[PDB]
């Protein structure tokens, strides 16, 4: 009989850990580092948080398994501090290697993601090189996956992504971002969950209404993977370039923060970098104004106090 | 604790019946027809199949409940024959009415959807007037719903619609259309299920990659609600303007029809209207050629035999 | 990484049509009838509604394709009228056949489902013989499926079934039955959807709390596939043996029917067969009493008016 | 229109963290401990892992906020080491309290879950006292929840549970347990995921086929929350009472561990406590026998090497 048919559900993959990358075995990757090191590369800064974990998970192996190939170097991991900036280089295969598939530290230093930007510039660090392909299938081990990007690219991973819309709401999904929008009378952004900030450009292939979108009228800037959509719009708002992105995990919501309220005026100044966490004396500013805002204003919530959108400045 | 969170599944609403529209009670609707009839309107042709059913489900009521308001007219329903064309008019509130909320046929004739295009032109028939709003909630009775469109519009319903994508496939969903696309190496259309053909324009708010889309490089023409997307692309193809849309229920697939095969050549002519159901003698044409096609070609499947895309013509 | 994992959703398969059974091709089935006819079998009465449709869908073929095997007989289908009773016989393979896989009506009559119980007794009709196995996979055509039951059995089909529970509610699912229960303070039945009534016994392998269940304390009797569960319990209630099961499609709900109310008393009589659709004069009985009931009482809703549970009788 | 309807999906809640219990505010709970302490109670050992985390998450508050009520004591948290045994007492409200809703350590010791069984016996520790009710709704903060159990009970929490079955497989779900069974020809257990081991009895309200189940023919013993079901059966097997439950996180699978194979014989001895992780010399035993087993045998997998079921013993 018939029958159309119809299926598919999405998504069930928020805040998971994750992630490893062996396989792909460090054989090809380590040989790439050796051939990259002689090319003058110095550091690696990850494009995703789990990528930084995968380096940290496998780094002691490359500390010695690379030395098993009579080549000497040292690699040390670091920590995560938002924003997770972008490197200006990448490494490519080069699939030829001379080593054994499963068969330190006096030499020069090859950096790994760490708060040491003053040591080596981002212009001398590879970025967004290794990524799925292949897949995440199928026993939660990925996968064998994490193939090398043949072509230099700025877009994020195209595999672990999602976007959907059903009659009241549209969401954009990846490992970290959970931008969500709703429809009261006009489609507009409602809430979003941020757990990191990646500088990779959001890919058009997983957006909605990607027509006539103004880069200056967004909510989340494109440079921090802001989806090109009308769902990134909101009346009386503009891009949050100077927002508190340096914080690690964030939250998007239209509301009033605790003990504070905002009055719509016109004497209030123009946009400016966010504030309110915290006052030097530990106090707060109960007064708040915004010129072209729209109540409820944008509050910033995370592993900290409160911040407000750049349209919101204190009266005094 | 936290918590993101994450939910939502879609979709579960293919080939359902459906559909009624009372409530909204025929009180306001019937009074609108009475005020529309004195405005020179003659016919109604539905924008969706279920709308035609709703007329057929409620038509005997307006045959007499309208006469209870000392106004006389006659309305007769018809049948469905693809394509379900579009009327060039609409009716609008006008919310003032003088009748009773629940408290023929000698006069002039007000037409209803039926195969009688030679009687009254489509330019004298209302179209795409009544639609949800409000909703479908919540006991499968809609809803109270089916409010009047204040503004004349060409886009289809924005409520009962859906679209999604998850790491391998993207689909566009409504009551009837089930356009689906996949990713082997480049994103392209794979299959689609057609059960009617509505002339309402597909709205951009539920599409994907709606940038740089060429109206001449689609698969499904925009005039028959072809989503503006790269997922409507396919290499070596163009728009199916002259396809066998007159058939009621269709099927999109890249394959070879039974007992036939296609050889890629260059002497084969250019595109032309589809064929192969059936030969005047009941035979078939085993030979097939296409100039700029790409195997497997486009076959048309439905409540009939086989048809091929316009790029596919017989050698002889 | 890890990873548990976790998936599965259920269900999306209510009120679907469905259903065909070719394949399995009528080759083996028809030969079985021919060998069954010489065994003295006379009638066929389906165990599911869709089975009756499958007979009706394929019956003209066996009217003549059986005659192609130089054996003559006649078969006529009928209609569906609740309840869909059970036959006391069945047909079994016997896989040997002498005919062609795809290569009337003067002789005796082999009855099929029809309101002709006075003609041939149910004790001379086969029942619950053909069923899935194999499956419903995978293009909505089943399947090839509908294999013969090697062993005589009374339980319903074990393939197309479902049951689940998640923190507030438990449901039992098949093609037609949608028994549902909830938890306010003690687990109890809340609502159920009936679209047919099959006499096959509900299988224990898809129930819940199948311990210490009293056959006299159910809501839906076992003989009409009442799941053996505590979720079939309700305080102050018993089995609905004499309910209005003769109606085709039903509805289970705890509420008051329109224009009527029930007062809890003790002078009211004991249980008795249901009523209230309709009064001989077309009226209703606004007064209602029940001895050991519990408000809200059980109302019967369907393609008819209202009926009440046997615990509910009029005061006069 | 109609409409049945049909919905519900399950589950999406594996390996989450979780969990906090404020609210309910420690006001009532702390006063309960103070009144419990004068009743001779000594320690607390949690029934779930997240409960132990909840104690660890809130313990410093009760270290001092209890002292704010001019009563002095000390509470020290510990660690988790399987199995998470059961205490023989509980604490009950007693809702009367004299303190302030949000307005150490010289005194006696009130113990908390930790590897100190030699200090205070489990017979002098409360267990399975606090649990949801109320709910987990609705911002991932629960909830306000964690109400006191009015009645002493041995069953686990009834709220955060799940069980389902759909045409090929049945699963039992809670925070940690993911017992799963399938159907090849007879229903039998296939795989299960264990991340803790709780001594609370599995509740019958969320099982399947809870009839005629023999406590000696299960796979997972009832004392460690083994669902009473036929899905806990397996031919040629019995209960895993003496299994390696002392390990924290486990895995159920029918397979052969790496580098080892099992031969079915009869000279092999009877059942015995599991082994094979590891040999005193770090070796393995490639030879394996089992009297009444059935290939593939039961392997134990987790944060360790391999173990085999009690039916499997070495030949030598």
Residue numbers in the entry:
A (entry chain B), B (entry chain D), C (entry chain C), D (entry chain A): 14 to 116, 127 to 339
What do the authors of the reporting publication say about this deposited model?
NS1 is secreted alongside dengue virus particles during an infection. It is a multifunctional protein which exists in different oligomeric forms intracellularly and extracellularly, and they play distinctly different roles. The intracellular NS1 (iNS1), exists as a membrane associated dimeric form and is a part of the viral replication complex. The extracellular secreted NS1 (sNS1), exists in higher oligomeric forms. sNS1 likely causes vascular leakage symptoms in DHF/DSS via two pathways—indirectly, by stimulating the innate immune response through activation of complement and Toll-like receptors, and directly, by binding to endothelial cells causing endothelial hyperpermeability. sNS1 when bound directly to endothelial cells causes barrier dysfunction of the cell monolayer as demonstrated in an in vitro trans-endothelial electrical resistance (TEER) assay. Here we show by cryoEM that the recombinant sNS1 exists in multiple oligomeric states: the tetrameric (stable and loose conformation) and hexameric structures.
